[PDB]
Symmetry: C2
Subunit: 474 residues, 2 copies
């Protein structure tokens, strides 16, 4: 029970304030390490206690939480209802991600109530995300170091130092309320060369190497000094259609293209099997997922027949839009090749991320390469941003899809209290979207890392966050 | 027995004169199609009859060939001893690849003798290569179209037309002396987009698609309309050492680096298993190959111990030089990662092919990515150019290796008449070179193509040439 755990990664954090963190490398540094949440998800994605011992939804708009007693922040401030209220007031407006809260009531020292302006059943998924991290009320009030560069929470690791562009160090919180850390220090070391991060595991300069390129996967698996860590991500990668760009307003054309694409060949040949084969717009770890959705079997004969039926017996010319990435270039080339096989001449339109988002927002694209992080692990964040009519463009609905029945089912699912009824509503939504062939799922995005064989208990959660709970250095 | 066979490929030929052809796309158009040779290699790489019915080596310097009777060139010129003599005189100098011939004697109408200036046992391998193609004596003498744009041979296909940058068409030679072609026409169509060439097999616009990128391999294997063709190449790809660049003049350092490299991970992760795992500088199809050569087992513990023994307990900093290629970039990154694991900091030096050859010729490099085509299928072409001391630099000996015992065994093997003794000499040479750890074999270069399932008898020979003998369109 000790030692310095070194994590070699591509980049530094840019901010350690969880109310303003916009990326995975920053969130992984503090999530469940310096900071903790009211609730957390278990292996089965079920909500379990953390800083809240119990919780209940009273009526539709009232959420009550019973708090853990005997908990202290790393600066000595007690953890209580007032600390929770002060934390969520920092992200409140009574008419952000907490735009639904009207008021926070302190019932007693260890009981807090959230009063919503409008119903929002995915509330727990927000409290379990990095944005739900509870800050010290002392760091919020008392004069001192900014939260962006000096985080202070209840977690098993205390912030020790930050050498920007070089390393972040955390040290074991010896006053942690739960199971204390089994390492003395954690170092997030910035090592931009991918080859060097992995090699450092074999020299014992690092224990974990993040951000592995797919071309290094076999080099990791065949090394006797390390293990490949691959966890089931929330993220989805797909070929989407702008349903208002001709001829993709014709569902037969979208269906023909779906029958023309074969994803096992892409997963193996392009991604070296890093990822999950999926047939829905959600991964198995997202609440509301269904394994009973219409998939379009790879069948070139059916694809050709459907295109002819659609009025295109000699195919047509179109475009596929993507951001510039080496792996995304290999992906669109496979798609371009498979669509040529059914007489569809695809021109690749590639540009940097900013220009790609601006063009998709203006509805300039026909086919596009899409991705959605599904960060909260709840169907609402997936469905509202990707398929609701008010999300057209860079918000997520790059399909420019507007089906009043889908809008209604989404708004209904967001407000439904029964989880069984919520699940049925998301299953219906996935049925409509896949039957309408709005997209062709490529893969569930899996997170990969390499670790020394001398590590026990390390994993990456479905959000892509490094998880150090129960980690031991052997 | 008929139809138009379409071959979609990356580039056009630049010349159809086999005495001046310097590349695979040009040679594949005429080899065993418009032109033929005195001899050819069978499936077991044994020399078999072609335009010569029989042959014998008289003493050391005299090679006699008995010619096939009843053979005519496509322009009506008879094939005979005078035609062979005129063809090889075009590539003769009695004090090119035929710098060994002193004189060509016409014994009778169907008997020809080659008199050598010096002994050269690999003579048949030169006669079986594209450079051994027999030109019409009428095309050499009589006034008309240049040989570079209008080839004329004895082959089963006659040259029909050339639309430069677009297509070359050959038609069935209805007067062919052997088994007549089972297709009417062959079209070598220039289609530069890789994705489009492969897709054309599914639309029936092409029957064969050449020059496949490794990222399309699985897309080919999973298509129901096509088959992946992969043949065992002569080419070798390796990591070489400049043995005069410190610290690689120390055989323990070269051996340590050889134990640090794992090639299955590269073959799978970088090349998608396109290629052959090998432990020698020769592939199994090269005459003289041995399966009993010292291989350095992937063993990081042995690598680290050997580096410490060598006087480098903390490793050292070095470079790896390569030409710019997407797949070669992924290869050197895996090597860089594996060498970091033993404390060797490798800087990648990448530049275009011309600059890379000039730098290796000036001995500027330490480690390098090497490749040797082994085109003739004979150990001499492999050994003389890569390891003989007179070949230092861009000629092939980028190792700057000069071992008098290796030079002597090479010169001895080139002049030895007994094939069993020749084989023993090449086995000894491979033992010395692999024991000296001059290089780390990465793979035997395999040639890949996609074909319609409606094709029978197509293959690519070990040289990378398309082979149409016995091809049928179903």
């Amino acid at each position: 029970e000790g030692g310095v755990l070194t994590i070699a990664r591509l980049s530094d954090a840019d901010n350690l304030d969880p109310h303003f963190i916009t990326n995975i490398p920053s969130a992984s540094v503090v999530y469940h390490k310096v900071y903790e949440n009211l609730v957390q998800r278990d292996k089965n994605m079920d909500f379990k206690p953390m800083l809240a011992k119990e919780w209940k939804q009273i009526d539709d708009l009232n959420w009550e939480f019973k708090l853990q007693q005997g908990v202290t922040f790393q600066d000595g401030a007690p953890f209580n209802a007032e600390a929770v209220k002060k934390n969520f007031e920092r992200v409140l407006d009574p008419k952000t991600v907490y735009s639904m809260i009207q008021e926070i009531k302190v019932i007693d020292e260890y009981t807090v109530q959230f009063i919503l302006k409008y119903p929002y059943s995915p509330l727990l998924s927000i409290f379990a995300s990095n944005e739900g991290s509870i800050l010290s009320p002392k760091a919020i009030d008392e004069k001192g170091k900014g939260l962006a560069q000096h985080p202070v929470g209840t977690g098993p690791y205390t912030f020790k130092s930050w050498k920007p562009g070089e390393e972040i160090r955390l040290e074991k919180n010896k006053n942690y309320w739960g199971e204390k850390a089994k390492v003395d220090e954690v170092v997030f070391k910035v090592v931009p060369e991918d080859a060097t991060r992995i090699g450092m595991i074999e020299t014992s300069e690092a224990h974990i190497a993040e951000n592995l390129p797919v071309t290094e996967v076999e080099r990791v698996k065949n090394s006797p000094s390390m293990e490949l860590i691959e966890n089931e991500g929330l993220g989805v990668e797909y070929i989407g259609f702008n349903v208002e760009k001709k001829p993709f307003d014709n569902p037969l054309v979208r269906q023909a293209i779906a029958h023309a694409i074969e994803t096992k060949g892409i997963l193996k040949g392009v991604y070296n099997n890093v990822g999950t084969e999926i047939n829905s717009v959600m991964t198995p770890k997202v609440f509301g997922y269904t394994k009973d959705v219409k998939g379009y079997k790879y069948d070139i004969n059916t694809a050709k027949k459907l295109l002819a039926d659609a009025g295109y017996p000699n195919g047509f010319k179109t475009t596929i839009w993507t951001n510039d990435s080496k792996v995304r270039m290999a992906l669109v080339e496979v798609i371009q090749s498979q669509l040529k096989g059914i007489g569809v001449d695809v021109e690749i339109k590639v540009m940097e991320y900013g220009a790609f988002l601006a063009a998709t927002n203006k509805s300039e694209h026909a086919m596009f390469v899409g991705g959605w992080g599904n960060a909260t692990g709840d169907g609402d964040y997936n469905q509202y941003n990707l398929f609701h009519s008010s999300s057209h463009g860079a918000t997520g609905n790059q399909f420019f899809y507007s089906n009043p029945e889908v809008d209604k089912l989404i708004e209904e699912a967001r407000k439904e209290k029964d989880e069984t009824k919520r699940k049925e509503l998301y299953k219906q939504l996935q049925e409509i979207e896949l039957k309408d062939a709005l997209l062709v799922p490529i893969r569930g995005i899996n997170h990969i890392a390499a670790t020394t064989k001398n590590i026990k208990g390390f994993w990456i959660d479905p959000s892509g966050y490094l998880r150090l709970e129960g980690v031991e250095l052997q």
